[PDB]
Amino acid sequence: TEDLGDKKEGEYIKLKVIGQDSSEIHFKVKMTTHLKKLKESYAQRQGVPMNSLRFLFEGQRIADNHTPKELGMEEEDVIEVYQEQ
């Protein structure tokens, strides 16, 4: 049931999140996942507030409720992390 629930939603894509120090963490998300969950996980692993960071896709700000589908993201796409302005 859980397995059939998962596959209806499709596959995970694997994104690479590149930090200010050029370190890298990959995240798997589904195409309809809100990226706030990625932003929060990344911030949590870096020890900093989420709102101290801005997350860009091809230079565009990623909103909390953006999804990979909305952004046109694909397997192996990159998210860049910068300090909030």
Partner: peptide, 20 residues
């Protein structure tokens, strides 16, 4: 530095090899 893959579960985030 070792490879790091985090699964955003939304849903079992344990297995980062997963694709569904």
């Amino acid at each position: 530095a070792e490879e790091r893959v985090v699964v955003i579960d939304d849903d079992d985030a344990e297995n980062s090899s997963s694709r569904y």
